[model samples]
Target: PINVAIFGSTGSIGTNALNIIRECNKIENVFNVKALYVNKSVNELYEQAREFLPEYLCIHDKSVYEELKELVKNIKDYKPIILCGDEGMKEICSSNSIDKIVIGIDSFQGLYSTMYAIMNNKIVALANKESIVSAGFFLKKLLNIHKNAKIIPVDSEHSAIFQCLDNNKVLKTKCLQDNFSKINNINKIFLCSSGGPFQNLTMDELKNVTSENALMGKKITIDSATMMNKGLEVIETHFLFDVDYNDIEVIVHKECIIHSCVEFIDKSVISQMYYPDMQIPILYSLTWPDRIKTNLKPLDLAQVSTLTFHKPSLEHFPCIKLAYQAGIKGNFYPTVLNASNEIANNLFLNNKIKYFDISSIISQVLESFNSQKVSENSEDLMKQILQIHSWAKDKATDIYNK
Candidate 1:
C-alpha cells in the first residue's frame, strides 16, 4: 500500500487532496492515508480526523492543543496521536511509514517540512509554491543529496510539463540539472495563464481597481492580476525541473485550457490539455505513475472553440517583470521579494498599499534587505533566508505605513 500525509489538511488544496484520497480508497493498496495536518482550522481538522482515521493529526497552533485534545475526545471510532507545534510537524515529516507527503502548507514553514520529508527519503508532491519560489536552488541541492527523493509537482502548470514529459527518460536522472530541461534535446517550456480578473486593464486602471474587484484570494488574486503567480511558477519550475530562466517562458491564454507546454530541440512540442481545475493535478499527485478511477467528467474539447495565446505586456502586469528581476538576483532578495509581496498583499487587502504601488514596494524591499553572500547548504541557507524575509516584511510594512 502507498501511504501518504497531507501537510495542510484544511485549505483548498488539502481539501481537494482528501477528495482524491476518498476516490483512491475505492481501490485498496492503491492509496492509504497515514496523517493530516492543519495550521488553525480546528473544526475542519476534527472532521478530517474522524473521517480519515489517520495515525497522526498535527495542528500548528500550539494554543489550540488543549482545546483540540479535549475536542478529539468525542472521536469515538479512533484515537489519533495529537501533535502540536514545530516539533510535532517535524515528527510527521520524519515518519518511516509515510512513503510520500503532499506539501500543501503555505509559507517558509512548508519549505522546512519539505526538507524534513526529503531528508527522511519521502516523495514530495509539492503544492506549496511560496517555499519553492523563495528557495528553489536550495531545494534542488537537497534533492541531489537525497538521490532517491522525488518532487512531483502538484501545480497545474508544472503538472502539465510533467505529464507531457512522462515518457522522457531524462526525468529519472539523479540531479535536477540533469532533467529534461537541461538535456541537450530539450528547447523551451511555455507556462500559460488565464490573465486573471483584470486582463485588459492598463497601468492606470490598476490604480482604480480595488482588491475586491481585482482578486479572489488576497495573495493569489493580486499575484494573478499582476501575473506574478506565473513569474513565481517560472522560478518554481526552474528549480523543480532544472530549467533555465531564459528557457522558462510564460504566455497569457484566456481559456486556461492548456496549462503548460514543452518544446524539444528536434522541433516537436508537447502539451497537456484539461479543464482548468485543481482537482486533476491533486489527483495526479496523490496517485503518481498510475492513473486511477475518478468519477469526474472528462473535458469535451469540441466546445472549447479556439485556444488563443498572446504575450502579456510587462507594463500591464508589472509584478511579473519584478518577479523575473528577483529570480535573476539569486541572493537573499527572492526571500525578500516573497515576504515583502505577502506583506504588501496583506496591506493591499487591508486597503493600505494601493494596487499601483505593489510592485514598487517589493522592488524597494529587495533593495533595502539583500545578503551579498549566497549559500549552497539548504539548511544553512534557510536560517539566513528567514531573517531576510522578516526584515523585508517589516520594511515593506514601514513603507506602506508611510
Candidate 2:
C-alpha cells in the first residue's frame, strides 16, 4: 500500500484528502495514510490524526505543542509520534517511511519542505500553486537531478491536463501545442477561469465592494475578483506544460463546470470535467494510475442551464493584466506578485482596505519591486520573499491610510 504523508493537513486540500482517505479505507486495495503534518492548526489536526492514525504527526508551531500533546494523549487507538517546529517538518519530509507527500500549504513557506521531499525522491502531490509559481523553473531543474522526483498536480485545471496527457507514449516535447511551437509542438492552451463573483460587476459597482463581502481568504478572494488567480494559473501552466507565456490563453467560464482544456496539433482537444468539486482533482493526484470509486454526485448537464464565456475585462480586473505582465517578465516578479498579493489579501481580509483596493495595493507594490534578477539558489528565494513581504506590508498600510 502507498504510505502517504500530508503537509498542511488542515486546509481545504487537507480536508479533501481526508475525505478521500476515508473513502479509500473502505476498499481493500487502496493506499494508506502514513504521516500527517499541520502548521499551527493543532485542534483540527488532532481530530484528523485520530481518524487517520498516521505513524507520525508534526505540528510546525511550537506554541501549541502542549495542547496537541494533551489531545493525542486522550486518543486511545493510536499513539503516533509527535514532532514540532521546522526540524519536524523536514524530518517528516525526509522520512523513509513516507512514499508520497501531499503539499497543501498555500504559501511560500512550504517551498523548502517541498524541495526537501523532492530531493529525497518522493512523489509530490502538490496543491499549492504558489510554490510552483514562485519556483517552477528552479524546481523543474531540481527534479532533473533527482530523477525519482515526480510532481502530480492537485489543482483542478492542471490535474485535467495531467489526466489528458497521461499516456506516456506521447513525446514530452510534442505535448504542448502553442506559441512555443518553434521550440517543440504547435497549437494553443486554453486556461479556463471561473471569473469569480465580481465577474459581472461594473467599474462603479466594483469600486464599492466591501472587504466584508470579500470573504474567502482575503488574498485569494481578492485574487478571484482580480483574476490574479487565473494569472497565477497561467504561470503554473507554463511550468506544468512547458508552454510559453503567449501560448497559454485564459477564458472566463462563469459556470466553472469545465476546469480547463488543452488543445493539440491535430486540432484535437482534451478536457476534464466534474461538478467543480476540488476534491475530485485532489483524489486524482493521490490515486494516480488507479482511481477509487466514490459516491460523489456526478455532473448533471441537463439541470445546469448554460456555460458562459467571455474575454476578461482587463480594465476592471487589472490584477489579471499585472499577473500576465509578471509572467512575461519571468523571474522573481511572479514571486513578488505572489508575496505582495498574499500580504495585501490578508490586509483586505482584516478590513484594513476596501475590497477593490486589494488589487490597487498589489499593483503599487509590484511597480516598486527592484526588478532584480532572480537567484538560482534557495537562499535568494527566501530573501526575495522577505523583501517583497516587507514592501507589501508597508504599501498596504499606505493604501489603507489613503
Candidate 3:
C-alpha cells in the first residue's frame, strides 16, 4: 500500500486529491491516507478526518486545535493524534510514516514545510507553486543535498510540460535541473491560459468588475484576470525544468484544451491535452512513471472544433510584465512580487482598491522594497524570504492607505 499525506485538506486541490485517493482505493486497497492538515476549516477537516481516519490530523491555526480535538473526541472506530501550528505542519512533512505528500498549501506558508519534505526525502506532489516561486533558489540548493527527494508538480501547466518531456528521462535526474534541459534540447515552452472570465473585457469594463465579479478564497480569480498566475508559472517553469525566461512564452488560449506545450530543438511540438479538470494532473502526479485507469472524462476534440491562440496584451496586463521583470531580476524580487500581489489582490477584492491598482501597488512595492544581505544557508534564506514577504505585504497596505 502507498502511504500518503495531504496538507491543505479543505481547499479545492485537497478535496480533489481525497476524491482521487478514495476512487483509487476501491479497486484494491492500494493507498493509506496517513495524515490530513488544514488551515482553519475545523468542520471540514473534522469531516474529512472522520471519513479518511488518518493516523494524524493537523490544523495551521493553533487556536482551532482545541475545537478540532473536541469535535474529533468521539470518533467511534479510530483515534488519530491531533497536531497544531507550524511545528505540527513540520512534523507531518518530515515524518517517515508517509511515502508521498501532497502539498496543497497556498502562499509562503508552504515553503518551510516543503523544505522539510525534501529534507526527509519524500515524494512531494507539489500543488503549492507559491512556495517554489518565492524560494526556488533555496529549494534547488536544498534538493542538491537530498537526492532521494522527488517533487512532482501538480499544476496542470507544469504537469503537462512534464508529461510532454517524457517522464523516465526527466525522473532519472535527481533535481530535474540543467541536465534534463541539456539532454532534451528544448527550444521553447508555451504556457496556455484560460485568460480568466474578463479576457474580452475592455479596460473600462475591467475597472468596474467587483470582488464578487472577479472573484483564492478572490485573489486567485484576480490573478487569472491579471495573468500574474501565469507569470508565477514562468518562474516555476524556470526553476522546475531549468528553462530560461526568454524561452518561456504565454499564449491566451480561450479553450484550455492544451494545458501547455513544449517545442524541441527540431521544432517538434508536444502538448498534453485533457478536459479542463484538475483531477487529470493530480492523478498523473500521484501515479507518475506509470498510469492507472480512472473514470474521469476524456478530451473530445470533435465537440471543441475551434482552438484559437493569441499573445497576452502587455498594455492591459502589466502584471505579466512585472512578473517577467522580477523573474529576470531574480533573488528577492519574486518574493516581493508574490507578497505584494497577494496584498494588492485582496485589497482589490474587498473594494479597497481599483482593479488596475492591483498591478500599480505591486509595481510600487517592488520598486520601493530593498533587499537586506543574502543568506548563506537555506534556512536563513527562507527567513529572508519570509521577512521580505511580510515587508512587501506591509508596504502594499501602506501604499493603499495613502
Candidate 4:
C-alpha cells in the first residue's frame, strides 16, 4: 500500500494530485491518504477531508481550523487529528505513518519542512520550486549523508528529465574514476517553456500590463512573463541532477507540448511529450520506480502537427540570467535570490512595481548581498541561510521603496 501525506493539499498541484489519487485508488485502493495539509480554502478542504478521510488534517491558517473541524462533525467513522499553524505544518511533513510525503508547498516554510522530512529519511516526492531552488545545496548534502533519501521531482519538465536520464541510453558515461562514482553521461538538459503570456508583448507593453491581464495564478503569471520560473528551474535542475550550470538550456516553445528534453554525448536528443497536464507527473512521482496506467488522454501529435521553438530574449527577461548567477554562486546567495524574488514577484503581482522591475529588484538585492556578513562561518548553517534570506528581503524592500 502507498500511504501518502500531502502538504499544500488545496493548491493547484495538491488539487491535481487528488485527481490522480482518485484514479489510482479506483484500481486497487492501494493509495491510503493518511494525511492532508491546506493553507485555507476551508470549503474545498471540507469536501476533500470528507472524501479522502485522512487520519491527520492540517490547517496552516489557524483561524479556519475550528471552522473546518465543525464542517466535518458528522464523519464519525473518521476522526483525523486536526492540527493547525506552524507546529502542525512541521508535524505533517515528518509524519512516520505515511510512506510517501508529497511536498506541494513552495518557499521558505517548505524548505524547512522538506529538510525535516529528508532528515527523517522519508521518501519525498517534491513539486515545490522554493524548497528545491532555495536550499538545494543543503538538501543535496543531506541526501549524501542520508542514503535512504530519495527525491522524485513532480514537475513535468524535471519528471521528463528524470525519465530521459533513467530510460534513455544517455545515462552511461565512460569517464573512468577509481571508484567509478563520478558521472555526466549527457551533454545538455533542455527545458521547454511556453514563452508565457507576455511573449508577444514588447518591453514597453510589459510596463503598462495590469495584474488581472496576466495568467490565472498571480506569482507564476509574473514569473512566466519574466521567465524567472525557467530560471528557478535552471537552479533546481542543477541541484537535482548535479549538472554543470552551462549544460542546462531553457528553450521557449509557443505550445507547451514537449515538457522538456535531454541531449546525449553522441548528440542524439531524447524528449518527453504529453498533452500538457500535471496529474501525469504527480502520478509518476507517486508510483516511482514503476510505471502506472493512467486515465489521462493520450497525445495526438498527428492532429497537432506543428510545434514551434524560439530563444528567450535575455533583455526581455533578465530574471533568467539572475537565476543562473545565483544558482552558480552556490552559497547563501541562492537563498537570498529566492527570498528576494519571492518579495519582488509578489510586489509585481500587487501592482506595487512594474513587471520589468521584478528582475531589477532581484538584481539589485543580489548585488548588495555581503558575503563577509553571512556565510558557513556561523555554527548553524541553516540559521545563517535564514539570516541571509531575511537580510535579502529587507534589502530588496529598501530598494523597492526608493
Among the numbered candidates, top lDDT falls to: 3
Note the clash tally of each candidate.
Answer: 0, 5, 1, 0
Question: Model 4, range 1-402, lDDT digits (tens) per residue?
Answer: 889988888888888889899988786676889888878888988889888999888888898878998988887787778998878866776677877888887667777567767777777888887777776656766766666667778878888887676433322421111111124466788889988888888878977886667752467677777788899888878777766789888899977889999887788888988887888888888887677766678899998799998889888888988988988876767788888999998887888998878888999988888664434422365677777788899999999888
State the weakest 10-residue window (summed lDDT) of model 4: 173-182
Residue 27 local lDDT, model 2: 63
Off by over 4 Å in 4: 167-184, 372-379
Candidate 2: tens digits of C-alpha lDDT, residues 133-238 = 8777667766776777778888788888776663443334322223224343335778888888788888998887766654524456667776788888888888
* Candidate ranking (TM-score, best to worst): 3, 1, 4, 2
* Per-residue accuracy of model 1 over 1-402 as CA lDDT, tens digit each: 778899898887888888877876775447778988898888888888888889999998988878778878877878788898888888988888889899887766678788888888888888888888877667777877888787888889988887777444544563244564655356789999898888887667777787778752357777787677887888787766777778877888999899999897776999999888888888776666777777776888899988999998888777887887788777766777888888877777777768768888988887776465776567777776777777888899898778
Question: lDDT of candidate 3?
Answer: 0.85
Q: How far off is residue 208 in model 4, in Å?
A: 2.7
> Lowest-lDDT window of 10 residues in candidate 2?
171-180
Candidate 2 residue-wise lDDT at 54: 90
- Sort the predicted structures by lDDT, highest score first: 3, 1, 4, 2
**In candidate 2, which residue pairs get closer than 3 Å at backbone N, Cα or C atoms, i.e. clash?**
177-186, 177-187, 177-188, 178-187, 219-345
Of candidates 3 and 2, the better by lDDT: 3
Computed on alpha carbons, the lDDT of every model, listed in order, comes to 0.79, 0.76, 0.85, 0.78
- Specify the highest-TM-score model's number: 3
In angstroms, how far off is 86's CA in candidate 1?
Answer: 1.3
